[PDB]
Chain length 247, copies 4
């Protein structure tokens, strides 16, 4: 396609699963992709080489999220990488970094709560805040949310709340950034097989009666990030295979 | 792109404005496009030749909508065209046919009401009903709605109600047709310049402070109609430039 | 409570089921209730006497809906009743009149479609239009919709579309009528037992695992119609026992 | 009315503004009201005496929110109060405690962010978690949110995100608690005058062209908390005077 020819993308948690497919799709369409990772160096290097093997350009960016100085670290390491190279600006920010918390309310601890909010809400918020100094006109902010923000799923309530908070950011920034031709969208995956009775309920929650694949999400994100989605902003884009549709 | 290589599309009111850009985008990506028209023969022939000049294939399909035997006529004329040719099936249905009624409630007559419901709701409903016998697996139903179904616009209330009714159809069919890998989506345009103080309020209703162009809608529709949007179904896809976002 | 002391209400299809409980609740709180009916004279007389027995005031209003001159007939008969009596104005309009069409798309006929749109959309629209000349400041318009407008229920698709259209009217009029302190709301019932496997799916579609009762709806409508809901307008008020909540 | 005769309510931030009107409305309808406060002892004592003067029963409950051991402290102090008295159970939880952060993204500090999340999300979450052990059948959880969760208001983005997260909790718990006849709802106030160009934009954001009063919210909350709203659950109840309706 070559829809992102000449552009610079950053994908938080870009090293694997959904993060990885996004990084790959964007890099395959000409984007220079900053592949962010917090823990998994080898997976980052894996994703980058994969991209380079296929004839795109990407580079690793190390920042542990949900720790004091996470956002600063991320953007410090992004600049360090581009310096003496493409300028300090970017076109496409994808907030994909996240940790799960599969506990209903009765079992969620302060430690687990604080951890999920630190990584899933606080990190992306300050990453985005510091993004706005660098984000060019016609740019893209894309937050990866969950079906569970808009469909009641008690067993992951604290996780869903973390994504809910980030969903409020999308319309706020689409309004603020609109005059510069920047779109801000949420893409909400459903239940995705990445790398007993649960697997069954989640497959059949789709009207297509399967789990999503990383490629399912990455295909929607690649569109939202293109000039073709320039008239689409402030939206919650359902990438769940029709989760929550009926009953 | 060639995203619709080998597929058959039907675009109701495909002869001009949004209808025309959709027809053109789809035909430019390899779709064989049935260009439907109710009144404007020359505009239909115009759109078809344009497509053929550019090296796609399309053909005219005549059916006056909101008259007894409209849906039958349409599908009679679609088949007549494909017969002894591509088989009777289709991949992509776009409900774009519509008439405006810019009157607030106090001024809407029975004649005008009945006319807008006949064209905007009753016609597309029976066109879709008769579509389901012909619609192949992995197919696409795309209804063109309005921003005014989800954002209060009193001055066009009866028109909005007509589109509202058709918006209920999208989730219903996405559930029913899901098992066959068919997606059903609404694409909602905003205020679009096609071929005094009104023009100003409508431009600035967008967070981008302009009217839409036909291409803005057609770019979103082309995506929804592609294999890239296969994980997107039952949705109301906002193609308004962020109309109704703030306040 | 006596929340509607001194007010005049009209409840379309007020003779039984949900219509009847609404009529009764409003009349029990001091409202003078015009009990509309299209076919069922005895049921109307039944509801009125019931109300009078309990020490409220109500009167019958005959108008066959979905026939040429329905809205005119209704308001002609409302005035005929109040004339030489309370003035021609009203405080509370409840659009409760409706007919079901339990057929999925493949089986809906033109006759059945046209009938459901005539009764469920066209009748209430022109009843409301003609209401606005008579509707006092601090007044109430309340449309009775269905859970199936916002939750995919293919088996009643054409019925849902009819209610969908009327749902677009609520926000339109809440904006137009706002300056006069009039609220316009939709109240959406779920599945309600009025006077095999279906009954089971509908009971368990509620998070409370029962069907609604008429009183469940009438309690919400009585609130929306009171000065207590004066800050609530343009809303789709869910009276379904949490239908469509999870999955 | 006496709708809450025999019931026990807890209103977080119940000492003034919206908190206070809620406390008063509930206590005026027979509820025993635990008036929570974090800083403002005199305001708490003020609200309690007011209630007692009018012939309801209420008591103060001290807990600084957004500090380690806030939820424990609150419930420790609730029990201490009821002990040797009404049992340890409650019927009605109102999450009204909140702090504002009127800064757009460019100006939000970590300190301010962490403070607003601690008070507005983390505190109510763990207050609710610990509530579920005590909450009786037919009970009520009511979260006080903001219009700005569903209408883009960039200038208060971090505050809105905090309320967004709590909005995800409502549908989750309405599903989980449904079988016990407990309703969980959000009530979203707009812009409310409590105890230059801003005041003007906020008044005219309502279709009624005024700011809300505490009583506007408290009237809706009193309904949601009554047996009359028993069929209303998982909902986002708009108490904004039609903020965000048009454009």
């Amino acid at each position: 396609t070559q829809r992102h020819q000449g552009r610079t993308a950053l994908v938080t948690g870009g090293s694997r699963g959904i993060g990885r497919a996004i990084s790959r799709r964007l890099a395959a369409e000409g984007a220079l992709v900053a592949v962010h990772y917090g823990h998994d160096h080898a997976a980052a290097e894996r994703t980058v080489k994969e991209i380079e093997t296929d004839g795109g350009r990407a580079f690793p960016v190390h920042a542990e999220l949900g720790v004091e100085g996470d956002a600063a670290t991320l953007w410090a390491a992004f600049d360090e990488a581009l310096s003496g190279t493409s300028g300090p600006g970017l076109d496409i920010l994808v907030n994909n970094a996240g940790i799960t918390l599969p506990r209903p309310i009765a079992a969620v601890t302060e430690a687990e709560y604080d951890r999920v909010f630190a990584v899933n809400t606080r990190a992306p918020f300050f990453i985005v805040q510091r993004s706005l100094e660098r984000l060019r006109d016609g740019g893209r902010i894309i937050s990866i949310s969950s079906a569970a923000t808009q469909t009641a799923y008690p067993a992951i309530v604290a996780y869903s709340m973390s994504k809910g908070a980030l969903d409020v950011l999308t319309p706020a920034l689409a309004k603020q950034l609109g005059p510069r031709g920047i779109t801000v969208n949420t893409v909400a995956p459903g239940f995705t097989e990445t790398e007993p009775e649960i697997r069954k309920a989640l497959s059949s929650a789709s009207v297509f009666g399967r789990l999503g694949a990383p490629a399912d999400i990455a295909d929607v994100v690649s569109f939202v990030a293109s000039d073709e989605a320039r008239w689409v902003t402030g939206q919650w884009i359902d990438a769940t295979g029709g989760v929550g549709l009926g009953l």
